[PDB]
Design a binder for this molecule. Structure first.
Ligand SMILES: CC(=C(c1ccc(O)cc1)c1ccc(O)cc1)c1cccc(Nc2ccccc2)c1
Ligand SMILES: CC(=C(c1ccc(O)cc1)c1ccc(O)cc1)c1cccc(Nc2ccccc2)c1
Lengths: 240, 10, 237, 10
C-alpha cells in the first residue's frame, strides 16, 4: 500500500509536493468594507481552496486506499480545521495579522466588522503566535495537516473496522515521521517527545476553532444575508 | 450524488 | 519558582492519583423521560463539578496560577474533564456509559433525550478506543490534567509556566510507557494516539455545550447557578 | 461575582 512502505523522508517529500498553492481573494481595496462583503470574500476564498484541498487529500498517503464514503466523511469533518491551520501557517510571519490571502491581510480591528468574528480572529492569532514561538517547520506543518485529515473524523464512522485500522497505521506512520524530523533537527529524546506533544495539543485548539466557526457559519446561513457556495453548503450541512 | 463525493471520484 | 517542575515522574503520578475525585452516585429511584434523564445527568454533573475544583487545585502547577487564570481554564475545560472521566469509568462496560455505579446507560436510552444519541455514540466510541488501547489509570490522570491545563491556554509569564508543566506531564506519560516495557517507537506512537483522542474529546465537549445552550433556552430543565455560570462562559458567542 | 471564585478560594 505504498503509504506503509514509505520512508520518513519519502513521506515528507510526498506531503511537501502535494501542497496546494496560496490563492488570492477578490478583495477590491477601492470598495468600502461591509460585513456582507468581508464574509463574501472569505467564503469565496474558502470555496476555491476547497477544490485544491480535495485534490490535495487524494495525494495524502493512505487516503485513496479508503472507501469513497470514508473519504467523504473525513473531509466533511476536517475541511474547516484544514483551512484554518493553513491560514495560521500563512500568518506566522505576520504578527497581529491574518494572511487570508496575499492581497487580504487582516488584523484584529477588521474582524470587528463582523459580529462574533473578533473572537475567532483572536483564537487564530493566538495559534499563529504559538507556531511562531515553537518555530514550526514546513515539514512539521504538512504532517500536522495530514494528521487532521485522517484523525478528525475517525471516531464518527459494519465489519468495516479494517478502515479504522489502516487509518491508525498511517497515523502512526506520520508520528514516526515527525519524530524523525525532530531527531534530525538535533533534538534530544526528551525534546522530541515534548515537541511532539506540544504540536498535537495545538490540534485540540484547532478543533475548537473549527467547531465555533462552524457554529457561526451554520447560523449566518439561516440569516441568508451572505450566500454560501453549493460545496460549502453540503460541507456545512454535514455538521448538522 | 454529493458534490464532494463527485469531486473525489473525478 | 513553581514546585511542580521539581517533581519526579513517580511523584507526579502519585500526586495526580491522590488528587483523584470520588465516584459519585445518582439518585436511587427508577423508564426515563427527557426531563428525568436530563435531570439526573445535570444534578450529577453539578455535584461532580464541586469535586473537580478540589482536584484541580491539587494538579501540580495549577495553584501557581492567578485566580482568574484558574477560572479561565476550568470554564474552558469543565465538560471535557467530565467527559474523559465518564469515558474512563465506562471502559469496562462496552456499549454502556457508566455515569454512576447506579446509573449505567446503554446507547438505546440516549434516544430518550433528543440529540443525546449522537453524543452517546461519540462517548461510547471513545470509551471503546481507550479499552482497545488498554489505557492505564496512570495514563488517564495524566491525560485529564493535560486537558485542564491545555484547553484554555491559548485563550489567554503564565503561559510559559503552563507549557512547562504540560512538558512535565509529557515526560511523565513517556516514563509510564517506558516502564510498561514499550520500545521508544511504541512510546511515541502511543503518546500521539492518546493526545489525538483529546481532539475528539474537545469536539464532544463543544457539541455537548451546544445542546446545553439550547436546553437552557428551552427552559424545561433547571440548571444550577454553578452550571449556568460555567455554561455562560461558552455561550458567547 | 462567580460561584467558581468561591469554590476555588475554599
Ligand atoms: C476564518 C474562517 C474562514 C476561513 C478560514 C481559512 C481560510 O483559508 C479561508 C476562510 C471561513 C471559511 C468559510 C466561510 O464560508 C467563511 C469563512 C471562518 C470560518 C467560520 C466562521 C468564521 N467567523 C464568523 C463569525 C461570525 C459569522 C460568520 C463567520 C470565520
Ligand atoms: C454526557 C453529558 C454530561 C455529563 C458528562 C459526564 C459526566 O460525568 C456527567 C454528565 C452532562 C453534563 C452537564 C449537564 O448539565 C448535562 C449532562 C452531556 C453534556 C452536554 C450535552 C449532553 N447531551 C445533550 C443532548 C441534547 C440536549 C441536551 C444534552 C450530554
Amino acid at each position: 500500500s505504498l503509504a506503509l512502505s514509505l520512508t520518513a523522508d519519502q513521506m515528507v517529500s510526498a506531503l511537501l509536493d502535494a501542497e496546494p498553492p496560496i490563492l488570492y481573494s477578490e478583495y477590491d481595496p477601492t470598495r468600502p468594507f461591509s460585513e456582507a462583503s468581508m464574509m463574501g470574500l472569505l467564503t469565496n476564498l474558502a470555496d476555491r481552496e476547497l477544490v485544491h484541498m480535495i485534490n490535495w487529500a487524494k495525494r495524502v498517503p493512505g487516503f485513496v486506499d479508503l472507501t469513497l464514503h470514508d473519504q467523504v466523511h473525513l473531509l466533511e469533518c476536517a475541511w474547516l480545521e484544514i483551512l484554518m491551520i493553513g491560514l495560521v501557517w500563512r500568518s506566522m510571519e505576520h504578527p497581529g495579522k491574518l494572511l487570508f490571502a496575499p492581497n487580504l491581510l487582516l488584523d484584529r480591528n477588521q474582524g470587528k466588522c463582523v459580529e462574533g468574528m473578533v473572537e475567532i480572529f483572536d483564537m487564530l492569532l493566538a495559534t499563529s503566535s504559538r507556531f511562531r514561538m515553537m518555530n514550526l517547520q514546513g515539514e512539521e506543518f504538512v504532517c500536522l495537516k495530514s494528521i487532521i485529515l485522517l484523525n478528525s473524523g475517525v471516531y464518527t464512522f459494519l465489519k468495516s473496522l479494517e478502515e479504522k485500522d489502516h487509518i491508525h497505521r498511517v497515523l502512526d506512520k506520520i508520528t514516526d515521521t515527525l519524530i524523525h524530523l525532530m531527531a534530525k533537527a538535533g533534538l534530544t529524546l526528551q525534546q522530541q517527545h515534548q515537541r511532539l506533544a506540544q504540536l498535537l495539543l495545538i490540534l485540540s485548539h484547532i478543533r475548537h476553532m473549527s467547531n465555533k466557526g462552524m457554529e457561526h457559519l451554520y447560523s449566518m446561513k439561516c440569516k441568508n444575508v451572505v450566500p454560501l457556495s453549493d460545496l460549502l453548503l453540503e460541507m456545512l450541512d454535514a455538521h448538522r | 450524488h454529493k458534490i464532494l463525493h463527485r469531486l473525489l471520484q473525478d
